């Protein structure tokens, strides 16, 4: 059998180099980095190299933190509940601006903050599937504690104007957080350009293991820990380090940014090839503005055949995709031209077959 | 070189079987268990087998949850901040009883809860290094939201009277949590016998990978999520599943409980052998009641030579241990009689050498 995987927004394959690099820390380098003895101190260099890779990936500076979390959900929960106690309660700034497009980690958390009597403005999506810089400026009260806008959307692949929203936040004196989960490895990410105070990411979206992520925290910005216990991560996030996944995620970031031109040049092209071809088969419109997107994602619709049906079919013929209904096909650098061609074929045949049962 | 590792309370070696079982999920079974397509659904059986192993390890029932967390720190933080909102605030039960002996994940969290105006009673340690059932009963007000007592202590290896504290909590109508991190794999753990509502554990203490743990939650007990986003873990703890570490931790628990008689019979004996022998070298008393302890841990003192000095020495001769000052030597099933003998030798020679520089 030979399966085609087009579900990169759900999760990605761990890069083989990433599997290789982690392996020694699952075998004989099993010491707790906190121990003083050799089993501990021996892990120190690989961890430092990892952190370094993470800093360079997002343009963090020495004076910033990139804190290791267990996933972007942790990161996101952490930013929101941290600001809740540091701003919303202790400083009266009882308002948070976000968008409707946000991942549930952000949205549900906000929902919880609402239940305690935080006022949350969920900026509405426009016709383009976007949010504009002016939209958040027009929403900032001076009780606004935080603006949280996702860098790129995982439904459509839509990029939002982070840089611009950054500027507004700087001018207005408001904490800015960007969930960048869907941007790492897909387009360049720059916390300096973004004037982010907080950035979250998750490794499994860029060929690292599931079960680890990061939160960038700008110099001098405070954020009450979500994991108290104050050992690890200059006391900001406690718990014995996930040594293998750290070493791994590090490598994952490095490879991810090394592939940034491949992503735009080749992956993007494969995505255009797929999209263009899908657009033929009679009555198939694409969803969203097709300019401001990460290179890897396309969301096609099939006229009067719910997505689920197309996908269940595609699954049977060994092509994995998901909805966003519409059909979300999302690529990685591990897709090939052959696989796309095949997808065009099997997609169209599937379309055909389902039209005919519809009669 | 041939190193001896006696720092099992810091962390343990991933069991080779555990490394084997996780491996396929780092290689080709990389699908998100939430996907509907084959890459997702194919992970379903291994995950179910894992969870099953976890349930049986602690005697959880079908009607309970064993929720997968990123570590015991997550678990502990989760219980405390969960009860804070569900009991302390929403129900006025503004008091928590714990002990002084607790791991910092519990203690620091409590410290934070104090800062919001929760009243926390930190039960004092006695001469035995213990806490008695009566001590917590005498502390329960009817504003008490939660009792949190650690099952076994990682400093001395001291077991606390969980079963008894359980009974008191049941009688008194109070939520009971036990951090069992230092008990899994060391003595039998039984949430039913314990009348725990909440139990935490962490895999790296029983030959699983760092970076994953569990919280047992009793049937019908509520606990507001620490990770909102409400996808995974019947919405109790959100974030893409750490598939490999889950499969791994599962195996780790199984092997851990399979070795329960080996642990008491052989590991315990090795520990007694080591202890007895150390007790000779002139002026070396052991620390704590030497009856109510997990089999693997001994905490010896050397008269007027701070622990750190003994350890730095021991490190040079390739024996890894830590303080608790006193010297904490903690064993696993991977220690051998040879290694202990060697330790007796090198320990005593080290004692000798440091006496003579002391002059
Ligand atoms: C933009 C974004 N934010 C946060 C997360 C959560 O990261 P995690 O904590 O590692 O799970 C994801 C991935 N989540 C999903 C992508 O597709 N379905 C999902 O549930 C994401 O795409
Ligand atoms: C009793 C207990 N509770 C909680 C933890 C925290 O588990 P983690 O979240 O997986 O780190 C540990 C391990 N911690 C340590 C054992 O020795 N030094 C330690 O810091 C522990 O022994
Ligand atoms: Cl918090
Ligand atoms: Cl919470």
Curated annotation (Swiss-Prot), chains A, B:
One of its GO terms (cellular component) is cytoplasm. GO terms for biological process: [2Fe-2S] cluster assembly; cysteine metabolic process. It catalyses: (sulfur carrier)-H + L-cysteine = (sulfur carrier)-SH + L-alanine. Its main location: cytoplasm. It is found in: Cytoplasm. Its EC number is 2.8.1.7. GO terms for molecular function: 2 iron, 2 sulfur cluster binding; cysteine desulfurase activity; metal ion binding; pyridoxal phosphate binding. The modification N6-(pyridoxal phosphate)lysine is found at residue 205. Keywords: 2Fe-2S, Cytoplasm, Iron, Iron-sulfur, Metal-binding, Pyridoxal phosphate, Transferase. Pfam families: Aminotran_5. Master enzyme that delivers sulfur to a number of partners involved in Fe-S cluster assembly, tRNA modification or cofactor biosynthesis. Catalyzes the removal of elemental sulfur atoms from cysteine to produce alanine. Functions as a sulfur delivery protein for Fe-S cluster synthesis onto IscU, an Fe-S scaffold assembly protein, as well as other S acceptor proteins. NCBIfam families: nifS_epsilon. HAMAP family: Cys_desulf_IscS. Homodimer. Forms a heterotetramer with IscU, interacts with other sulfur acceptors. This is Cysteine desulfurase IscS. It comes from Helicobacter pylori (strain ATCC 700392 / 26695). The lineage of its organism: Bacteria, Pseudomonadati, Campylobacterota, Epsilonproteobacteria, Campylobacterales. The gene is iscS.
